[PDB]
Design an enzyme around this catalytic site. Sequence first.
Site: not given
Ligand code: MG
Lengths: 992, 268, 39
Positions: A345, A686, A690
């Site tokens: 990410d 995070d 995700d």
């Molecule tokens: Mg992120």
Amino acid sequence: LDELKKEVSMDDHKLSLDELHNKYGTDLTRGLTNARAKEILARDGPNSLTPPPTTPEWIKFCRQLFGGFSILLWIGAILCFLAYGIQAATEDEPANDNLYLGVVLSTVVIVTGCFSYYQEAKSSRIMDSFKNMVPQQALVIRDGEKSTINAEFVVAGDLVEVKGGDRIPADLRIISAHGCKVDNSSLTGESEPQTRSPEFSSENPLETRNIAFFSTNCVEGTARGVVVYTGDRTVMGRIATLASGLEVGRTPIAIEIEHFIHIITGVAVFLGVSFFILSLILGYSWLEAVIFLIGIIVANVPEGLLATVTVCLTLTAKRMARKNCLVKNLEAVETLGSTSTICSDKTGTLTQNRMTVAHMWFDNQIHEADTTENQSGAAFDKTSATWSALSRIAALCNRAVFQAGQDNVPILKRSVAGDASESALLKCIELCCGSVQGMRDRNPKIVEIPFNSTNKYQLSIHENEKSSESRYLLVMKGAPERILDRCSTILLNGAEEPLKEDMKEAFQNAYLELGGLGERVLGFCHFALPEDKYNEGYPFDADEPNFPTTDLCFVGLMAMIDPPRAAVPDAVGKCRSAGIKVIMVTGDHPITAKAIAKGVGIISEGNETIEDIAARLNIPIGQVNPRDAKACVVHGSDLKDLSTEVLDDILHYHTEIVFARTSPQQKLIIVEGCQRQGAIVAVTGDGVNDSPALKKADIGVAMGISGSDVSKQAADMILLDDNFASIVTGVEEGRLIFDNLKKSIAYTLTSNIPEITPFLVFIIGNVPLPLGTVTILCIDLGTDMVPAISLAYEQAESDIMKRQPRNPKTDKLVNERLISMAYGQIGMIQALGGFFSYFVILAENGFLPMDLIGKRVRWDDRWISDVEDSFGQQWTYEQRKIVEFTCHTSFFISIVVVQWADLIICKTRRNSIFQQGMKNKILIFGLFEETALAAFLSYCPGTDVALRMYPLKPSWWFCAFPYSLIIFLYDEMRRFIIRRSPGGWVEQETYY
Amino acid sequence: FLGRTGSSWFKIFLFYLIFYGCLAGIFIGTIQVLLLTLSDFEPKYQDRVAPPGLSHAPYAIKTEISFSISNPKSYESFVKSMHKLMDLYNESSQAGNSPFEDCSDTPADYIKRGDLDDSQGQKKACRFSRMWLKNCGYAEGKPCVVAKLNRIIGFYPKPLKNTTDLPEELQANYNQYVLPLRCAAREKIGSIEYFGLGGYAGFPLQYYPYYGKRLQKKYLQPLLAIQFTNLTQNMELRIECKVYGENIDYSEKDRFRGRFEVKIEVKS
Amino acid sequence: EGPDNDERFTYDYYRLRVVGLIVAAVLCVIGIIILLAGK
Ligand SMILES: [Mg+2]
Ligand SMILES: *[C@@H]1O[C@H](CO)[C@@H](O[C@@H]2O[C@H](CO)[C@@H](O)[C@H](O)[C@H]2NC(C)=O)[C@H](O)[C@H]1NC(C)=O
Ligand SMILES: CC(C)CCC[C@@H](C)[C@H]1CC[C@H]2[C@@H]3CC=C4C[C@@H](O)CC[C@]4(C)[C@H]3CC[C@]12C
Ligand SMILES: *[C@@H]1O[C@H](CO)[C@@H](O)[C@H](O)[C@H]1NC(C)=O
Ligand SMILES: [K+]
Ligand SMILES: [Tl+]
Ligand SMILES: [Tl+]
């Protein structure tokens, strides 16, 4: 099952408000009926998420109790009770042998079960985190009246109302809104507030303004909407199910364990039954044939090995806990070392997740600011009088403020009330000009025009802090081009000057460069109003232009971005030097995604996409050979219409990949694509978007401070300080533990031979039993334990970060080279050293080696209390047995003595001990404690009854010393050959 | 094949052949040096045989000799072992002045034939007639068990002195030259009868010390015949024969350490 | 000695045990010292 959920969603934001009501039998104004709502409740079911069916801990514990070694140990434990039963019936045996050994072995299975159970842990509460995002209550309009209801009682069709501060209770079709902004970071990973209005604004429902989603929250304003989806049927409720439902799967390390279990189990059953028949042919009673088999089992199975592995893993996880890297699953300690591909990410992972000033354009010059958290860069400018003029506008033409009580925390980390761009500017000036509040006290704001959608600028009028003036200063900021159309002069190095086409072109150049860097650019200008035309009491009208907004002085430009974390660029390069492929997978827009890719080193300098080639050469993209482009940037909207085979080609054909504007399922798809090619993949993230990717990853790593609860539930590892450098450490630790496990496994296996061979010679030679079953467990469960563990503290023999990731198909934890060395070479030398001490004890008591062949018959005969030795003396039954058990004791101690050398040689696979040294203090501890244990077991009074351990005479301890030394020399000579010729012979044969 | 090519399969064979060959040659070498440190006449250690064991001829199934008097093949098992032992004490086996000698027909003192050296031929052992074993096919009814003291090189069995009280209080106490053997069971339902050298219920000290198989082959150790003409029948009788001496001790674990454990039962 | 050679069939297993246990203990202490050089 979940293949449906891996697909992009379909919606009804294209319908008119009225049309949408027909579909759900609803009223736009009155809302649903109390009766119709209750009807739909029973129909569709609750607005809730149901957690997936889990496997109870019962079945999880017992599933370990039947994995190769435990199976063999069970056969042994029962075969003990078998021989015991056969005894209790035939000849009354007042002994406790088979009974107790059967109890001991069954305990070994249970305790070993706890260790593997502890290792195979799965702490997963994905669906629980998602459930936490549904509010307890919602506001609905029913029978023309608004009331709060249990959010679970919400159904498709009713009229819902939301306002700033509340969670979206369900997927809504916006029908009415007033200044409504929403935080869609759940779906995108980006927290910038998105406007919501009844008007349809994109074919893509995840981008349109007239849809609001469950799992997100309203940040400001008010909105009303019609519920289109409830519970599991919402967009993120499906993501929930997908994430929670995904099959976990076996880790690389787990697969390795099972693999050597098969090997060792194989040789165990081989020699087991190979000698069981070999005994019956020799005319051994089934009464004995089983007793020998039990011994064979105990000899072949390394009873303490699986627990060693677990402890070595645990100890490695403890070291990483001490670097702010929490491991939730013990096996994930190794996966990072076997990782060949990282899918990362961007926002809050690679980046700080905070709009930060990156560059400034003043004095016809591009200046760069420091974007790093801890400010590890340098200054750009302080001297120029222009800077102070720009700095003043950035502070004054700004409505952002620091939250109360932050004075303790660093400037860049403190919470700010305001939009991202104003916060960035605030923190920029506060950093390099001190307290901004001071600047806003010295220059009292009298009138302002806040940033308007139509004006595209924000202006402010302040009382000049200067005493010799104390007059009125005008400042404004906005779109760079709009600010330009309002300027006549430019503050160059202090003094103003006319805005000639020259500087105007340099402005465009500066503007295009900063924008090319993926940075948001703002214009800044001011105007010192004429004193005579503006008295100390002159009133300014903000509603109607009461003051000039043209012919102003352009001061400068400022650019900003959500920047990389300080450690990220260097960590990315380090991953790439270790031969790990790094891919970006983000919900963010392509221009931003690509710019950070270059910033952190995902896309290296000079590498191009097909679009880059086309623009440079000024040719159509179809005219570009796509193989000429090693880098690519794929938008989620295009990803959606590509098959997996085509996704596989993208993955194969590019070294530098950026997947931008991806949905959560799309991240999962990219991860699966990488895995499909046979790669071990890590995910770093995070956000809740995700979660599926983190679950599917061989190892998911979540950010600890910036991470959402969901992401950290889906992960195997948490970076508690958001230190991306920890990934580099993790892969290094992962590789080191993999090698050290080999060392520890070889060490443990080596001592199997000296435990097997005595039982074989007992049959083939008909001599007294050299070593007992109990004695074997004193080794594998006792003496070898701490030494085997200590190998986990071995330093690397070379630069492990310099080698490519292991091939999980070829590079195994236990191979033929390990068995050849442990079983065929070193263990064989240990066996002899054991036998030697055995012959020494017997010969010094009167039974010379020659007379021992074929004597067991009379030796074991309990009724012959007069066996003749070589010297013509006569021994009772218990007398000769004391010597025999003393033989078991010295054979045992011989193993310990030969394991001294083995411990030192297993220290290194390639290097010499004279190179690697003896700096492992745990290992040295192992040597001392091992010897202390052995001595205690021999000399402690009463141990001759509980374990049949007898006191050894001082000379006995030294029997195996010459064998212990030969091991050290042999292995040192062998490894000297390895190093001296990387060719292959010694290497391809014995190099673990 | 399975692992490698033929060339590799060969090399792995040439290695392990030379390797195991060397290891065998080294193992043998260490056995050589061990033997080189040992005497041919006397073992390095003797503390594990120290207190002599007492063993008998009737091969006990489990320290027991039960049989039926009214049955032939009921005791023919115990007569096999009884014969095996006494067959060695034949007069035809003890012929000429070599290597046997006529010793006192009455219990006498020790006899030292020098040291444990080969500086002399085969050390001459005292003759022993099985004819000294009065009354004892063997006892078809009420067995005639034969006792024996385990041989230990250089061991001088020393009888107890009549300083204080004794079990068989002072009766036929040949204090200076006899190692006594008194069998017992309370439970006195038997009839102990002992036979031996000089008619004494012991071992004549003139048969000591034993010089070992290498320095004294054909050597004969003294026997003590014991007959239980018990007037009882059809019950397990736990009879323990105990030897007494300064160098004689016992153990709760080793039930043969200077004593017997016989479970006679004439179930007829 | 001659008939008084009782020492030939004797071994001080008691002292050996005392010494053996002393050694085991001291090796145990030494080990702790080296391990505790940093914990
Ligand atoms: Mg992120
Ligand atoms: C040792 O003495 C026994 C005494 O019983 C011998 O047994 C003799 O066996 C022969 C042939 O089987 C019989 O004819 C005799 O009746 C037995 N007794 C005697 C006194 O001669 C036995 O043969 C002898 N063993 C050796 C090896 O000489
Ligand atoms: C007690 C004695 C008689 C048993 C001796 C067993 C010997 C013959 C065994 C023990 C370990 C064995 C070796 C272990 C490892 C390998 C490597 C593998 O790629 C091929 C077989 C090979 C080379 C084995 C051949 C046979 C071997 C050398
Ligand atoms: C033993 O045999 C003798 C003859 O040799 C005989 O006189 C005597 O009665 C027997 N003794 C016993 C107790 O039966
Ligand atoms: K995972
Ligand atoms: Tl083992
Ligand atoms: Tl082992």
